[PDB]
Symmetry: C5
Subunit: 203 residues, 5 copies
Amino acid sequence: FQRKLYKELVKNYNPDVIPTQRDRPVTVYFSLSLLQIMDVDEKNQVVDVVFWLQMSWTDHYLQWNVSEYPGVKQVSVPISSLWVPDLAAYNAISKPEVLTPQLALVNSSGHVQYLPSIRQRFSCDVSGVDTESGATCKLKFGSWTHHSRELDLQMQEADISGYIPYSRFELVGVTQKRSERFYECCKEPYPDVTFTVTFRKKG
Amino acid sequence: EFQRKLYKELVKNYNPDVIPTQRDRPVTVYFSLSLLQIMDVDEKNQVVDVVFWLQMSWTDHYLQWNVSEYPGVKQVSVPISSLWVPDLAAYNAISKPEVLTPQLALVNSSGHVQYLPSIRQRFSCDVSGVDTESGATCKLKFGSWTHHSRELDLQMQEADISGYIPYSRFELVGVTQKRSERFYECCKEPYPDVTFTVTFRKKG
Amino acid sequence: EFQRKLYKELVKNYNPDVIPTQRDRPVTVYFSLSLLQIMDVDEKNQVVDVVFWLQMSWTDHYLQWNVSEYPGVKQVSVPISSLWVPDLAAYNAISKPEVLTPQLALVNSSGHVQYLPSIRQRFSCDVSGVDTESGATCKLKFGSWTHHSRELDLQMQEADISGYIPYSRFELVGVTQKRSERFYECCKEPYPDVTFTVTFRKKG
Amino acid sequence: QRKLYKELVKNYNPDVIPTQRDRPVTVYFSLSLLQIMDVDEKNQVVDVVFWLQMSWTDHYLQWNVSEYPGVKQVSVPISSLWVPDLAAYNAISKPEVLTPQLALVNSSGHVQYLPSIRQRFSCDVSGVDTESGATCKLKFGSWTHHSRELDLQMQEADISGYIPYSRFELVGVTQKRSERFYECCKEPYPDVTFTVTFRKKG
Amino acid sequence: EFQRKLYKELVKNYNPDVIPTQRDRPVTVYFSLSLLQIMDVDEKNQVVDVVFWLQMSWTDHYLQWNVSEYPGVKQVSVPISSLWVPDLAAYNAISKPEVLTPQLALVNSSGHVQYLPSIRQRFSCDVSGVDTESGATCKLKFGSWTHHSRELDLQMQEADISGYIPYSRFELVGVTQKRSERFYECCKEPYPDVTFTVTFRKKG
Ligand SMILES: *[C@@H]1O[C@H](CO)[C@@H](O)[C@H](O)[C@H]1NC(C)=O
Ligand SMILES: *[C@@H]1O[C@H](CO)[C@@H](O)[C@H](O)[C@H]1NC(C)=O
Ligand SMILES: *[C@@H]1O[C@H](CO)[C@@H](O)[C@H](O)[C@H]1NC(C)=O
Ligand SMILES: *[C@@H]1O[C@H](CO)[C@@H](O)[C@H](O)[C@H]1NC(C)=O
Ligand SMILES: *[C@@H]1O[C@H](CO)[C@@H](O)[C@H](O)[C@H]1NC(C)=O
Ligand SMILES: *[C@@H]1O[C@H](CO)[C@@H](O)[C@H](O)[C@H]1NC(C)=O
Ligand SMILES: *[C@@H]1O[C@H](CO)[C@@H](O)[C@H](O)[C@H]1NC(C)=O
Ligand SMILES: *[C@@H]1O[C@H](CO)[C@@H](O)[C@H](O)[C@H]1NC(C)=O
Ligand SMILES: Clc1ccc([C@H]2C[C@@H]3CC[C@H]2N3)cn1
Ligand SMILES: Clc1ccc([C@H]2C[C@@H]3CC[C@H]2N3)cn1
Ligand SMILES: Clc1ccc([C@H]2C[C@@H]3CC[C@H]2N3)cn1
Ligand SMILES: Clc1ccc([C@H]2C[C@@H]3CC[C@H]2N3)cn1
Ligand SMILES: Clc1ccc([C@H]2C[C@@H]3CC[C@H]2N3)cn1
């Protein structure tokens, strides 16, 4: 008993299908928690970054009658088992290295939360990393195949308290804003949240 | 959704190992390379590390549907492992290709597939004059690995250069893209290949 | 002893994605870290390369059997991909964990699972005073990643230090291990965590 | 018109070497040297990039050209059929295959597999700076199938693929197949060995 | 040949996760290491990069057949993923093992299996005196990870040293191989292990 819910939640479920529903796009809440700026290649213009990626959305195919399943309040599912935002780091110059277990938490109302810790390298102008002005990196994320009307990317207060106390670099400033733009190819507009970080070398 | 019984259909009698050529008609795939950055240049070993968007599109007749039978379904985002994809290859690459974006293609209700993966790969290139005013010239040659002219028709299309990183140790002196058809030792037929030629020099 | 129709049974109605709880009964997993070596210390980027032996054990009620019905079968060696395993995570790790040993767990006839993977992983750590007599102190924090206190109860147990390599550029000034319960920004609940604190200094 | 794939993979086990009574499967092997990436003089290794040209005949893979109209050949994933389990006896790194792992199959069952590969080999690169140059022996051969199961035959090695620029110039190249017995393994195992002699330009 | 309806049979009621033991009869596996090369030595981190042939053989009673019912079939080349294989582990390795050859073992008509992987792996080792005449001594310890003495009996056998590379920055001062049995902190039973000890020094 108890987890005959997994048998159910994955019965007629195709993880390749964005769980939208007539007119209304699936809205995914995105937020980036900067944890550390590992390195800066001044010669090739890249930053090695470690961060928490906070994503949540609602999959209507994934809800259940809390009755029929007694104590089951939430379930920990493998992201390979359900649909997940196909977010992409636009300016990344390296495959993303996901450091935590690829599990997602699912609510009895179908609310999903996937919170992977990641290390990835981005293309960035790290010129003034030694000036008082510092260097500014723009970490741009957004769905890769779903446009505004299919997947609505919404941001939400970026956390900065995870930032490592020691660390060769100090955070001069941080901002996060979502945008919508058209691309050479692809007819529709694409929403994207961009985490902008300004940092300088301590001392 | 509610109407994605379309995926169940699109993959029913579908073998992704089968090039969708419809009799006496080679599948024509449109190819274009958007140079984003020239990461490094190994002058000692003659290689360039390059990052680029790869724009490919073609038509899979097995993948079309009656827009009626499936109400609001205009297009679908499918895993490239689920359908046939051009077996393009970097003839002069000296490293496996590292695909940076989600491996998904967009499929039209008329069977038009689009696949734009961002890739980082190293190529064999004579980077001698990367410091001269002439600059170094790298030829990134791509082409279908096992399908010849009559099976897969590689067509190019205006290469985009606006994606190029503004900062970056290197500046783009020149860029050209042209498709060709050749004969190779072995393989009876001729194979088409689009070659992106880039000339760049170190700024300052 | 042949009669391994037990594996057929142990994996019949078994979903490894399901944490083996039982109403108001969290699965308690015993965790312990045996430090084997401190490979390197990046003073520039603040990281430590560490090789350790994680000792984990817990009870999966779905995995017990009547020792009668299966004669000589005392225990079984199963692939961790075949059963539920604590989704422990290195909270301060800056690299994917590289597991060096076969990913097999041992299972008791009473459902007691043992899993002791040897691992090499890099952690974020202030390795400033690695040359001072005080030494540097690294905190290796582990904890479930998706299950809170009431679902998975992380319990520690005497950390072993005898595995530490005799030679090695570094000597162990001190070691402590303690479990805690904290709340995080997001996730409404408490997630227990055992933290292995190591203080080491460069020999000579 | 590809119900041929459905057929070609029906009662087909890619783990079974396509032999017949007292008839070893003969695979034609040839290496096209494309580039000598690097040379570690301290550890004695060469980084090499090359085209491997393999062909053989799989009798399970032929069809009546009639029953399948225009189908002259098919491009199949090597995971779908049997492929020589060749190994680089002296490689010190896993092989990195750079091209799509697809093979071409004839209507008569003739298979062709041409994978571009980058791999590192153990080699005495001492005299890479002398006029004599360094000589590397790239030895390949079936890993589990002996002479009577898999007959490795060589064939004129191509050298025109060699990169014009490149820190190194090709002083000499030879390719020869051999048969030997090893410590263990009762039977003799054949192997084609590509020997390259190169020196640093200038 | 062919008559490979033998593979269909050999894998019918076969679970590769089941050690082919049998009531008071541990499966005995013969292990031997052929040192081919000592790639590098990190004196700062105390590690050795090594390339070796691991020679393993054992008997799987589930894998035998009536040589009659299958005419010319003397032996078969099977993928190790298809049958049970000793879960040997390099107790003191600090890197995942990189297997360089095709992962196939050969199987006798009497059930005798032979796996012969070539491997490159890094081990924790005190490479202090690699420049002294005494040389450095590395102990490569292997052993089953989850099966104790009574389940899997590890037996050694004359280590081969003729595979050692003639050139190479290092020369072999000495080589010895011996199996042992111990009891460990945890795990009730005793576990057997073969340890390849190599002493080498820098040439010249
Ligand atoms: C489903 O929920 C309804 C109310 O929302 C409840 O009346 C019903 O009993 C539930 N299903 C069952 C029978 O478990
Ligand atoms: C479900 O998730 C949503 C997310 O906002 C939350 O509001 C709600 O309280 C959660 N509880 C359940 C079980 O629905
Ligand atoms: C499309 O589907 C409709 C179903 O009502 C029908 O007219 C017919 O089967 C199809 N015709 C096309 C291809 O437009
Ligand atoms: C255990 O299983 C056996 C069947 O082999 C059954 O007869 C017995 O009642 C069960 N309980 C005991 C006695 O352990
Ligand atoms: C396994 O069962 C034994 C009795 O057979 C019990 O005492 C022990 O606590 C259990 N767990 C282990 C393997 O320690
Ligand atoms: C080939 O096929 C034709 C008709 O499909 C048949 O009549 C003929 O006997 C076949 N020949 C072969 C290859 O045996
Ligand atoms: C093994 O082979 C013999 C061959 O005559 C056959 O009778 C039977 O399958 C096996 N032996 C017996 C008599 O059980
Ligand atoms: C096959 O049988 C022989 C005896 O004929 C025996 O030594 C061993 O089990 C097998 N030989 C091999 C492959 O070592
Ligand atoms: Cl298959 C495919 C089609 C289009 C795209 C483009 C749409 C968004 C914005 C740029 C890139 N991601 C990416 N992939
Ligand atoms: Cl899917 C998901 C939900 C919540 C979490 C959070 C809970 C624990 C503490 C921080 C992180 N791990 C991580 N992942
Ligand atoms: Cl299996 C196979 C057969 C032939 C080929 C050839 C087709 C393209 C052009 C030369 C080479 N690559 C590639 N692969
Ligand atoms: Cl499973 C197995 C058994 C034997 C062998 C050996 C036979 C040929 C020659 C050396 C190596 N390849 C390799 N693998
Ligand atoms: Cl699941 C499990 C049980 C026991 C062990 C230990 C027993 C042998 C000796 C150390 C390690 N291998 C490792 N894993």
